[PDB]
Structure 1
Amino acid sequence: VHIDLSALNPELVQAVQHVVIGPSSLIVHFNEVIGRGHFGCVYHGTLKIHCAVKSLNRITDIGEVSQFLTEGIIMKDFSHPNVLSLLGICLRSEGSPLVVLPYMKHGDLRNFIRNETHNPTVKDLIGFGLQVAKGMKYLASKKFVHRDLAARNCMLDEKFTVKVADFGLARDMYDKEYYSVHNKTGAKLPVKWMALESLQTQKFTTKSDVWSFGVLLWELMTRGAPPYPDVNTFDITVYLLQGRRLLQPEYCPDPLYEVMLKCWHPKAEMRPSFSELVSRISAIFSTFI
């Protein structure tokens, strides 16, 4: 893997020095896999900054190198406390580049809320939801559409700060169960998180991210129950069109369920913005002790 600066959009050339990590600056501990995606494994690494280093060597070919760099450059300029940051990319003589992310001590949000070790309160769970909403408000303000928002796709650091993850160079399928193959297009889709219109057109928007966020809130309040367990894959469209939504979890406050129903409005344009979600959830959160 060689970097040809001329091949890039000339406006981005200056950003390369800030995204590329010199191999001498990074040590990666390949002895133990700490995480797995469809595109490769992840390992502990030290930059002493502790990091998660993701290999992309399960992919046959990584595509256009200039595009990969461009994706990295665009990703690295995102900075928000509820969005996973890119520390950089590191080139290795043999194999694809390594993607270098901050280490997230407590892993993905779904597994965290399912863990018997931890006991977040209803207030804590709502706060996790608020943090996600803030990250998504940021991403939406950058006109970035996530396309795969779900509890499995957010992570928690050592201070229990929630970060929207699984985007840009960290994008992957980290739990294959929840992705079904479309018969016409072949795309593997997170159907149980998708908006009605996306199930029909396969177009994703910020308003379809809002639908997914509604599902994520439901996951939080059920402590990571699988949505629609008694529905099979693409029959979700028929199920929803019967006039159905996920039921109100026992400990979900009534106004938070109302927020969920708004996220699942049949008219995409009538769903709340992430700014409105931050406002509404902040209020509900403030009522708890």
Structure 2
Amino acid sequence: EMVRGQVFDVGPRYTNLSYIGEGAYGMVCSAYDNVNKVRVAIKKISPFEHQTYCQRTLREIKILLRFRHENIIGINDIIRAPTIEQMKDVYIVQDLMETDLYKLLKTQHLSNDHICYFLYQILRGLKYIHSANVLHRDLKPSNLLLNTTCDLKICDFGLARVADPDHDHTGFLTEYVATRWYRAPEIMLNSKGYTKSIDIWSVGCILAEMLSNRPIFPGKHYLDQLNHILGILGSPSQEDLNCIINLKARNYLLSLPHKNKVPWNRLFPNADSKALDLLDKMLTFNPHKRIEVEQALAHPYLEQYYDPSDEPIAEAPFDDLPKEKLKELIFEETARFQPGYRS
């Protein structure tokens, strides 16, 4: 139990603590699990002051407790106080992961084989997620935890939602949007953060980042984000212009000079041509003409790994409450890891 950076108190089961880092309203350490005799990761979370922090916490916990897949991080144990009034911190215990794709891309240029098998694992996990009618909504390199070239896990389901192509509100900045660089164009143009297509676009961006060691659409803001995308894909066609469900949005693009489509091979000269064909289909502007997860796995680029017999799906398809009500729901969701739990 260290006190240098916010009291941990995860003992006596979890000892020999060591600081890793800190992200998203809390802190992260690795500890020794005296029950499983192996080092695990523990994230300390203190979200109860801010209602949005309570959203993501409850959101991620409900989903991860239901999900079970090699390519998706899980929750091993949750530590919290016996009473709601005493609970000010939550401790989520997960498998220790050596690094993530973000850190890896900073130090190494990936070979084609490791890019190929990384891509498979992402889509493998994503296939499960989408089969449960769930969208991750924030897929990016830092959310891809890594041990080896063969051990990739998807994490951070804080922004995850149940798929819902129907409901729409056009609430642009009223909803906590995804990481800009990996954000589908439909989200920025006509507010569409509830279809599976958005996750595929993110994976495309991740793929392009694996081929060149740098973000492909690194805009400063959302209009600049659209600038980068059209700067590579080219000016949207007449039909793609009709996908835009917004008056003022279908205007900034029309004032922009006409852009030619930059060939993928010109951007990535050293890339596998099969990779670039898949990339092309993941980064299609039109969300309806964009490749789906099962189709991507079946692309020739992944033909050496693709195996529907070894690609598990969900056995069953899977808010605006105050921070005090959400805290109760978190207190209930974590109640299964408490002594004396019934039903």
Would you say same fold, with TM above 0.5?
yes
Q: Which of 15, 24, 27 is 2:14 aligned to?
A: 27
The reply on whether 1:209 has 2:195 as its aligned counterpart is no
Q: Shift of the alpha carbon at 1:260?
A: 1.1
5 Å matches for 1:102-113? 102-105=95-98, 107-113=99-105
Contact 1:26–1:45 at 8 Å: present in 2 too? no
Q: Which of 201, 208, 211 is 1:221 aligned to?
A: 211
CA distance in 2, matches of 1:210, 1:55: 31
Query: What secondary structure sits across from 2:88 in the alignment?
Result: coil
Residue 43 (structure 1) aligns with: 29
5 Å matches for 1:1-289? 26-27=13-14, 32-47=18-33, 48-57=37-46, 60-61=49-50, 71-92=60-81, 95-105=88-98, 107-116=99-108, 120-157=110-147, 160-168=150-158, 184-185=173-174, 187=176, 189-204=178-193, 205-223=195-213, 225-229=214-218, 231-234=219-222, 235-241=224-230, 242-243=234-235, 247=264, 248-280=267-299, 281-283=301-303
CA distance in 2, matches of 1:67, 1:195: 21
Q: How many residues align?
A: 248
Contact 1:227–1:246 at 8 Å: present in 2 too? no
Deviations 1:7-45 (A, max 9, x none): xxxxxxxxxxxxxxxx66631555x42022132210012
CA distance in 2, matches of 1:145, 1:285: 24
CA distance in 2, matches of 1:38, 1:246: 38
CA RMSD of aligned residues (A): 3.3
Q: Shift of the alpha carbon at 1:57?
A: 2.5
Q: Shift of the alpha carbon at 1:184?
A: 4.1
CA distance in 1, matches of 2:30, 2:51: 22
Q: Shift of the alpha carbon at 1:268?
A: 1.2
After alignment, is 210-219 or 94-103 more displaced?
Answer: 94-103
**Alpha carbons of structure 1 residues 62 and 236: separation in structure 2 relative to 1, 3 Å:** closer
Contact 2:74–2:95 at 8 Å: present in 1 too? yes
Query: What secondary structure sits across from 2:29 in the alignment?
Result: strand
Give 2:292's aligned amino acid.
S
What TM-score comes out, normalization by structure 1 length?
0.73
**Alpha carbons of structure 1 residues 238 and 26: separation in structure 2 relative to 1, 3 Å:** same
Give 2:221's aligned amino acid.
T
Deviations 1:39-68 (A, max 9, x none): 221001233132111111266346798996
Q: Shift of the alpha carbon at 1:284?
A: 7.0
The structure carrying a bigger helix percent of its residues is: 1
CA distance in 2, matches of 1:246, 1:96: 50
Gaps of 5+ in 2: 1-9, 161-170, 236-260, 307-343
Query: What secondary structure sits across from 2:303 in the alignment?
Result: helix
Contact 2:71–2:152 at 8 Å: present in 1 too? yes
CA distance in 2, matches of 1:25, 1:249: 52
Give 2:21's aligned amino acid.
G
CA distance in 2, matches of 1:40, 1:217: 30
CA distance in 1, matches of 2:156, 2:263: 24
What TM-score comes out, normalization by structure 2 length?
0.63
